[PDB]
Design a protein around this ligand. Structure first.
Ligand SMILES: CCCCCCCCCCC[C@H](CC(=O)O)c1c(C)c(C)cc2c1nc1c(=O)[nH]c(=O)nc-1n2C[C@H](O)[C@H](O)[C@H](O)COP(=O)(O)O
Ligand SMILES: CCCCCCCCCCC[C@H](CC(=O)O)c1c(C)c(C)cc2c1nc1c(=O)[nH]c(=O)nc-1n2C[C@H](O)[C@H](O)[C@H](O)COP(=O)(O)O
Ligand SMILES: CCCCCCCCCCC[C@H](CC(=O)O)c1c(C)c(C)cc2c1nc1c(=O)[nH]c(=O)nc-1n2C[C@H](O)[C@H](O)[C@H](O)COP(=O)(O)O
Ligand SMILES: CCCCCCCCCCC[C@H](CC(=O)O)c1c(C)c(C)cc2c1nc1c(=O)[nH]c(=O)nc-1n2C[C@H](O)[C@H](O)[C@H](O)COP(=O)(O)O
Lengths: 228, 228
């Protein structure tokens, strides 16, 4: 057992769930407010911005480094990129928009690389980005996540299937999400810390209540298991 | 008096001071190593990546948000962007590649905006990115910084003058840099925390020694002034 770390991410995209930009902005500021004043477990913030091509004039690409606090992660963008991270034993950052199956393929490819280069990654913990929508009515959590993501999936011309996206993220009641996320972590050898995106939750009070309930549960768990 | 915060940044660019990429990479990992094991003041890490255009298909641009730890900053890319940050009282991130004169214009434009919107920014602290090259021989610090930046300035087709860039950053002996940086902060109303880029220092031991000496000096200062 080890202490699992949590954080938050924001999707840097202007059109989500037919919301006007200033509404999306306002919702995001509330999330920030909750992290700063209402809770203590949300350690770092990151942005999802891989929908934009970041290339130089000669077609070489910006290196996909992401800092989380003082820790540098490499966005797991392709099997080749994960091998470059393995060369230095650097932690990965898994995309929320990759299916769980793809994430697992990528982590194992990384593990194969390290073994091949003889790099000790025993202590490396990666980060997994997940969209989280918790609703007492499971159907409503899913509908909300779906509506939120429609323009982005359309923009990115995703092959995916919103179904898969949903299955690879966390939409449902609290208990279902807890378990589903633990399952996904297991799928990734329990080597992943997390970044959650709560922006699909339309109700700000529900978002607040969820973030605070989870904060308290994690603090208790850490204490109970001598994880702090 | 207030506690000034420090961090580090890396320039996400492959060609610096005629170094092969793996050498630049290796130097950067040493910086990370020093921050994690040898010191405690370097709080956050960021990347300089504004040399790449980040636009959508319709010519709209990615919003220039940067997270530092759990704090969201807006890159001060233009007077209009700074007004958008002022609307919400968000902190700015000043570019190392803007002359000091331009930074001062931008901060005051931000302050004018906030006053106009009646937004209280009393408590806001911004972050300033600076390249730091400390050498007992002042001439050598400058030459090193100049050689390091030549390809980047050329790529960005900077209007600037490496001279100005140098004057707006910190190259020289330790005491000169301490004072020069304090001066720049004063120019920005003492409302700036910092991000330093040490990558132009060719000698890894000198880089290490500098980072550790500064760490100790800051800890003492904080204690002496009841800043912690
Ligand atoms: C607002 C967010 C809602 C979305 C939900 C996100 C869920 C986050 C992951 C779950 C955290 C649980 C702990 C907690 O309540 O804080 C949790 C759960 C629900 C489950 C089923 C298993 C967990 C777990 N948390 C763990 C943790 O922090 N550290 C661990 O080491 N293990 C955790 N586990 C057990 C895990 O599934 C594995 O069984 C063990 O890691 C295996 O260890 P071993 O026996 O030593 O090999
Ligand atoms: C602690 C981190 C600080 C970073 C400081 C900036 C240093 C830049 C030099 C990086 C050199 C690496 C090469 C090596 O083996 O050492 C490197 C790395 C680690 C990564 C992740 C990507 C790199 C890369 N070097 C490149 C280079 O010299 N020239 C390139 O043209 N591209 C390089 N890349 C990018 C990589 O080749 C891929 O194009 C991107 O990862 C995008 O991949 P995709 O989308 O998955 O296809
Ligand atoms: C490896 C890096 C080398 C590059 C050098 C970076 C320099 C960083 C800025 C300087 C930090 C000094 C403190 C320290 O040693 O840790 C410092 C210096 C050198 C000077 C000349 C003035 C400083 C100062 N640090 C300050 C700080 O942390 N907090 C403050 O509030 N004030 C500092 N000052 C004084 C400042 O110039 C102003 O006089 C006061 O802020 C004015 O306050 P007021 O009277 O209450 O209005
Ligand atoms: C706590 C932060 C979490 C972020 C979550 C993502 C939210 C995205 C919505 C942002 C809406 C803003 C508009 C408003 O007044 O509320 C906003 C902001 C704050 C900023 C900094 C830039 C924005 C922007 N909204 C835009 C929009 O709706 N449509 C656009 O096409 N562009 C927007 N921009 C970008 C801005 O207009 C500039 O193009 C960029 O700042 C680049 O500027 P330049 O390089 O300085 O020219």
């Amino acid at each position: 057992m080890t202490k699992w770390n949590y954080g938050v991410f924001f999707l840097n995209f202007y059109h989500v769930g037919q919301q006007e930009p200033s509404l999306t902005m306002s919702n995001a500021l509330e999330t920030l407010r909750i992290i700063d004043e209402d809770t203590s477990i949300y350690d770092v913030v990151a942005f999802s911005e891989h929908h934009i091509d970041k290339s130089y004039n000669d077609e070489t690409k910006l290196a996909p480094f992401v800092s989380l606090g003082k820790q540098i992660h490499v966005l797991a963008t392709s099997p080749e990129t994960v091998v470059k991270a393995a060369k230095y034993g650097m932690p990965l950052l898994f995309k929320w928009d990759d299916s769980q199956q793809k994430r697992i393929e990528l982590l194992n490819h990384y593990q194969a690389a390290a073994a091949k280069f003889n790099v000790d990654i025993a202590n490396v913990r990666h980060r997994l980005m997940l969209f989280v929508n918790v609703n007492d009515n499971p159907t409503q959590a899913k509908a909300e996540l779906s509506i939120y993501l429609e323009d982005y999936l359309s923009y990115t011309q995703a092959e995916t299937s919103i179904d898969e996206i949903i299955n690879s993220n966390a939409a449902g009641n609290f208990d279902t999400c807890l378990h589903h996320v633990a399952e996904m972590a297991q799928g990734l050898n329990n080597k992943v810390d997390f970044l959650f995106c709560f922006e699909s939750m339309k109700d700000q009070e529900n978002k607040k209540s969820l973030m605070i309930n989870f904060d308290k549960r994690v603090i208790n768990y850490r204490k109970e298991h001598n994880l702090n």
